Amino acid sequence: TVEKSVVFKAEGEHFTDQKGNTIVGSGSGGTTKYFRIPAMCTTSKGTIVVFADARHNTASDQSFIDTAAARSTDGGKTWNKKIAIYNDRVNSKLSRVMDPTCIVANIQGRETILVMVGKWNNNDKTWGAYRDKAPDTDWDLVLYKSTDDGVTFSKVETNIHDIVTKNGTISAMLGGVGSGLQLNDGKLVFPVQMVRTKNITTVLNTSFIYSTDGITWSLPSGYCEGFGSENNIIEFNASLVNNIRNSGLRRSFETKDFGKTWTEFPPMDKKVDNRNHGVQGSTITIPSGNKLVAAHSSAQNKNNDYTRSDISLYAHNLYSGEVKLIDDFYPKVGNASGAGYSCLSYRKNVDKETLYVVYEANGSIEFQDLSRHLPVIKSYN
Numbered sequence: 349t350v351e352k353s354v355v356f357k358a359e360g361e362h363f364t365d366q367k368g369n370t371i372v373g374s375g376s377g378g379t380t381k382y383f384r385i386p387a388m389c390t391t392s393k394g395t396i397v398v399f400a401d402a403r404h405n406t407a408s409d410q411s412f413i414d415t416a417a418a419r420s421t422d423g424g425k426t427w428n429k430k431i432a433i434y435n436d437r438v439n440s441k442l443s444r445v446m447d448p449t450c451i452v453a454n455i456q457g458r459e460t461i462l463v464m465v466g467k468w469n470n471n472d473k474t475w476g477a478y479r480d481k482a483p484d485t486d487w488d489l490v491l492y493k494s495t496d497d498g499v500t501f502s503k504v505e506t507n508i509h510d511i512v513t514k515n516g517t518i519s520a521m522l523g524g525v526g527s528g529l530q531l532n533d534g535k536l537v538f539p540v541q542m543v544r545t546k547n548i549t550t551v552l553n554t555s556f557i558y559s560t561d562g563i564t565w566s567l568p569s570g571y572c573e574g575f576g577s578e579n580n581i582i583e584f585n586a587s588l589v590n591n592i593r594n595s596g597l598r599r600s601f602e603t604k605d606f607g608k609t610w611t612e613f614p615p616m617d618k619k620v621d622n623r624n625h626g627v628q629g630s631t632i633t634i635p636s637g638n639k640l641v642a643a644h645s646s647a648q649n650k651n652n653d654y655t656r657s658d659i660s661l662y663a664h665n666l667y668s669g670e671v672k673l674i675d676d677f678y679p680k681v682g683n684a685s686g687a688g689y690s691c692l693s694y695r696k697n698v699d700k701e702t703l704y705v706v707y708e709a710n711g712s713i714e715f716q717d718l719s720r721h722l723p724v725i726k727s728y729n
């Protein structure tokens with residue numbers, strides 16, 4: 349409901365910690381240096397909540413990171429900002445909570461926003477390098493919830509570290525990045541990515557965790573293949589269908605038996621090319637009369653490298669398999685330090701439909717209202 353705004357400004361934000369002290373980052377004036385990995389959830393009140401890594405010192409994945417949250421009640425025009433989740437502060441160089449996935453859901457009648465992030469403290473290498481232990485002792489996956497429309501967040505005591513430990517073949521697990529979903533039966537579903545222990549031949553796999561209450565979670569028995577593992581899931585006739593990052597063409601599989609076996613989903617499989625290395629992308633459904641349409645954002649990556657230019661919106665005809673570029677909403681070369689991620693959010697509140705996007709823009713997170721494209725996306729079925 350603004351057409352375009354900056355949510356978090358690289359070298360332009362100041363945050364305080366739990367005691368009220370400023371967090372002196374490496375940006376000019378001690379600001380947070382860089383923002384990455386935006387996740388957006390919109391509530392039934394019309395409130396927009398945006399999470400992102402506040403990477404205080406560098407754009408690097410292995411650095412000092414807190415999860416920042418921004419809340420807008422005026423359609424994305426102004427943003428109220430704070431830290432939603434603080435890292436443990438064991439190591440000032442490496443302690444981090446990162447890569448948010450959010451869900452807005454009604455759980456037993458209460459509208460709740462959930463945010464899940466991975467947490468590390470002493471690991472100095474990329475998470476894919478730690479495959480000895482089940483799970484890695486430095487890792488954890490933490491879940492916070494808000495029941496007051498995004499204003500306060502508190503930690504949820506979960507059985508997630510236990511189901512991973514009981515599985516015995518997973519070194520670490522992370523959300524798929526962006527947003528999860530609530531199924532038509534009420535269950536919460538987080539798409540997940542997992543690094544398997546060193547003896548499993550596949551390093552990475554994709555799957556999901558599910559819960560009825562947000563507290564006790566379960567893993568299905570099967571695994572989808574991994575590719576670039578960041579992924580989202582959509583519900584389509586109670587198949588669950590994911591859409592996975594891959595170097596080159598994105599992949600899409602379907603489960604008809606709730607996570608026991610996955611087979612390629614032709615309407616979305618290999619339809620968008622993100623070229624070299626791959627990028628995270630956001631995929632959601634939009635109802636169109638009694639049919640569904642899948643809306644998707646990811647980078648065109650015209651330079652075929654880490655600059656991941658041209659973050660675009662696509663519509664996927666779930667019936668015919670046709671794909672159409674609806675809008676290249678950020679038609680710029682990104683910063684190779686960390687670029688190209690995005691998150692879509694669609695909501696219809698009473699009779700008002702909104703389609704919003706948040707994305708990485710040279711270290712900052714930008715917001716755009718894309719609702720003007722809904723007629724065109726809704727026609728693709």
Ligand SMILES: CC(=O)N[C@H]1[C@H]([C@H](O)[C@H](O)CO)OC(C(=O)O)=C[C@@H]1O
Pocket residue numbers: 385409446447466474475476576578686687
């Ligand atoms: C936890 C973590 O490392 N996440 C990072 C992810 C990961 O490194 C890669 O998917 C290999 O596993 O890569 C990137 C990236 O811009 O490509 C950003 C994420 O923050």
